[PDB]
Design a protein around this ligand. Sequence first.
Ligand SMILES: Nc1ncnc2c1ncn2[C@@H]1O[C@H](COP(=O)(O)OP(=O)(O)CP(=O)(O)O)[C@@H](O)[C@H]1O
Ligand SMILES: [Mg+2]
Length: 321
Amino acid sequence: HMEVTEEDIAEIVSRWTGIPVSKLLEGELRLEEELHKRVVGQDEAIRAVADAIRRARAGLKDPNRPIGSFLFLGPTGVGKTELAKTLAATLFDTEEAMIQIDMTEYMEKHAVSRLIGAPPGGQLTEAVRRRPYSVILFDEIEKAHPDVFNILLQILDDGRLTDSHGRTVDFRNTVIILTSNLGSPLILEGLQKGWPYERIRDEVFKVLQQHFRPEFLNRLDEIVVFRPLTKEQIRQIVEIQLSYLRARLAEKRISLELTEAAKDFLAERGYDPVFGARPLRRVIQRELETPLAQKILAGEVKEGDRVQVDVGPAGLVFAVP
Ligand SMILES: Nc1ncnc2c1ncn2[C@@H]1O[C@H](COP(=O)(O)OP(=O)(O)CP(=O)(O)O)[C@@H](O)[C@H]1O
Ligand SMILES: [Mg+2]
């Protein structure tokens, strides 16, 4: 039977139950390759997440806990959020299924009420109430007030939270992702001041031991250390970040052919150890989109054209065969 599809039936069941389509169609796995469509490198992170999901779906884990819980260590701008968003879209149909909580906004004692509700629901509890199938991302976890930190421990331990009214909110269908870049600025400080490797490594271990206790770490499925990106990995990210632009140009049958020097130009400006690849978006906007816009408006780049992008003296240069 060809007319009614698997997706048709899943859609009806999803609307009737609240269970996401991808969740119902999970069986019809190759989750790593799917996540890799959007996340370049961080192979260890990807396998950690997929392995935990496999253990849960196979019935090997405690049913009264989240699907998975992770701490993502390592530097900023190298894929922690891209993985969380991709995971949400892949497991739960959409990126809207990622809930982000910035712990720098939860540093003071009374922030607990922002999470679970004021004393006689709050941000987190109400969010998870309407979307039980969610990836919850807590950024800079070490900055949370102890009272806030304790509420996370309840989620990990019990797979649920009681809000400030007395109602239990279910977290058994969530994935928990905690992030911290602790250690990364310290390394940069030591490399700039010229400490021997030995002192840098000792100091990193010290700050980790100060903020993260074994009793906390033991609760997690995995601790993953994200790595700085290689030059080739940054080049692959350049290509991904150009997809939308390429799609827009394709409507006018315009194509963009970047030389290797041009791709390296964007890669070199769009990434550093301090911000990771966070700068790359506005580098592409300023170095490529803007002068390309001028050419299109000037009639120099026409519908149908293949445009070669190279490195000139003043930045990128555009030529039309
Ligand atoms: N490994 C990777 N694969 C694909 N894209 C990546 C990537 N690392 C970084 N990027 C791109 O660079 C940007 C920053 O990455 P991401 O947001 O994952 O880092 P982050 O979550 O550590 C920043 P913050 O610490 O500010 O939250 C994203 O838009 C992302 O698309
Ligand atoms: Mg992030």
